[PDB]
């Protein structure tokens, strides 16, 4: 594989290199900070033909001109004026019009926000190793622990959590600074183990050690997210803050990513009193699946009006014995929406059974018909699945995760194995992890 030699040439000059990187960072900054209209008109408009989006539009590296792809207008600019590099305004990527290719494989250009520190970053950090670059790695079952490791896999392949952990924000603020005592510190060792270099079971052991000081994967998901929150709270500076996060609004990773809220509407038909109506935080939604076949059917069923049967009920206000009518609706959507399919039916006789119904779930899920009051398309992308294999009593949990570039992996204890979208979609899903992808 070749590196572009035109840009290598330019980089032999020390001013020019510096100029290219300032321009690359500014272009990229501008693209992240231009309201859609200004972007269309000032970075997506060809200076030669004046069309918007004539294929990709490229912002010249050496002058203010923007030129399109479809009519070879940036190309003409490069030939007529000698400017052979432009930045694609949809994605910040640098194109060489002599190579007729993107310059993709030069870490400094990719990491151009660190230009001013580059010699240090070069000599003191390294690129990921081929084997760790996607953090793929299994966790050995250590005595009925797939209920924990399944969720952990989904957590360490969650983009929000990986960015959080690798940004060192917990590491920088933690008052415990022990992975034997602090769950968030244990999670960081896991990430450290899987993505850098610290078998690859130490963070997990430490996690189990954090748990010694005090079954269902859904329970563990709630347990672990709650403990990330507690760690955040434990790190706060004073009592006003501890109180604020606990009672008003928490800005922790868990509460700015996974939490939404439901409107529980309860309304009497005769007179409309709705004072049993509430708005409640959720960190996931539990869906019934008896006799249904598709995830959208379970969501309709979650969101539909039902009559509350309540022995000898009379509405406080109007005295009607008519069943009050309840309806759940999403009031606030979270960035990562986690759905639980209720498979473990705990019955009146004490005897659980497991529901094995296959429920069809989409790779792209649209939540618009489940939000409360015309609501616009709100689309999430599937990135995580936890499945339960076997009996209520004797059973085991598997995780499936989607990583960058759309490739899917099955995590079955120590075994990690490749798998296709098409076969993952045939799974008996227990938990589903969806990440916010488009809001219209």
């Amino acid at each position: 594989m070749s590196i572009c030699p035109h840009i290598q040439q330019v980089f032999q000059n020390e001013k020019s290199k510096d100029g290219v990187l300032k321009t690359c960072n500014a272009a990229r900054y501008i693209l992240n900070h231009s309201v859609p209209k200004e972007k269309f008109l000032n970075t997506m408009k060809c200076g030669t033909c004046h069309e918007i989006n004539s294929g990709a539009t490229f912002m010249c590296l050496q002058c203010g001109f923007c030129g399109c792809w479809n009519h070879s207008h940036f190309l003409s600019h490069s030939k007529q004026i000698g400017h052979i590099f432009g930045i694609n305004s949809n994605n910040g990527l640098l194109f060489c019009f002599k190579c007729e290719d993107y310059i993709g494989n030069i870490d400094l250009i990719n990491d151009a926000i660190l230009a001013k520190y580059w010699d240090d970053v070069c000599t003191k950090t390294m690129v990921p190793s081929m084997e760790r670059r996607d953090g793929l790695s299994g966790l050995i079952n250590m005595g009925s622990t797939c209920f924990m490791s399944s969720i952990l896999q989904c957590l360490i392949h969650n983009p929000y959590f990986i960015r959080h952990s690798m940004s060192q924000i917990h590491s920088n603020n933690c008052k415990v600074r022990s992975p034997d005592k602090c769950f968030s510190c244990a999670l960081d060792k896991i990430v450290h183990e899987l993505y850098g270099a610290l078998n690859r079971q130490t963070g997990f052991i430490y996690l189990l050690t954090c748990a010694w000081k005090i079954q269902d994967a859904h329970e563990f998901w709630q347990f672990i997210i709650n403990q990330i929150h507690q760690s955040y709270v434990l790190d706060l500076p004073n009592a006003k803050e501890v109180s604020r996060a606990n009672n008003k609004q928490c800005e922790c990773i868990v509460h700015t990513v996974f939490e939404g809220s439901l409107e529980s509407s309860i309304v009497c038909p005769g007179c409309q009193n709705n004072s049993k109506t509430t708005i409640d935080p959720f960190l996931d939604l539990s869906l019934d699946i008896k006799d249904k076949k598709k995830l959208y059917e379970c969501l309709d069923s979650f969101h539909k009006k039902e009559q509350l049967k309540d022995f000898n009920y009379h509405c406080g206000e109007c005295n009607s014995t008519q069943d009050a009518i309840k309806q759940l609706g999403i009031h606030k959507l979270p960035s990562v929406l986690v759905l639980q399919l209720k498979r473990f039916e705990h019955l009146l006789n004490g005897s659980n059974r497991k529901l094995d119904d296959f429920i069809e779930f989409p790779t792209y899920l649209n939540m618009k018909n489940y939000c409360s009051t015309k609501v616009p398309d709100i689309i999430y992308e599937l990135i995580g699945i936890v499945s339960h294999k076997g009996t209520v009593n004797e059973g085991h949990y598997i995780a499936f995760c989607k990583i960058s570039g759309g490739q899917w992996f099955k995590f079955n204890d120590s075994m990690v194995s490749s798998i296709s979208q098409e076969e993952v979609l045939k799974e008996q899903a227990y938990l589903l992890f969806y990440t916010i992808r488009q809001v219209n």
């Binding site: 000032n42 690798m166 993505y195 700015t256």
Partner: protein, 85 residues
């Protein structure tokens, strides 16, 4: 209306109601919050947490990181400087 009709011009009606270099957007961009490509801001303020984190198209590149040669920690680009100093 006809798809095949030759277009004369822009309606005067509409004109009566409306109305250089890419580097010159910088002033404005400096004074403009973080924009998304396909996540409408009024819908965000309405249907999402006031403090939601959003990573748009999160699976459309790996998380960019480098690993410290001293302790092996995977470091995000914007955390490397700090972790050196």
């Amino acid at each position: 209306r006809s798809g095949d009709a030759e277009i004369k011009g822009i309606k005067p009606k509409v004109i009566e109601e409306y109305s250089d270099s890419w580097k010159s957007l910088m002033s404005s961009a400096k004074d403009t919050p973080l924009q998304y490509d396909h996540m409408n801001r009024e819908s965000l303020k309405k249907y999402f947490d006031p403090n939601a984190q959003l990573i748009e198209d999160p699976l459309d590149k790996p998380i960019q990181y480098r690993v410290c040669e001293k302790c092996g920690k995977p470091l995000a680009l914007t955390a490397i400087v700090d972790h050196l100093e």
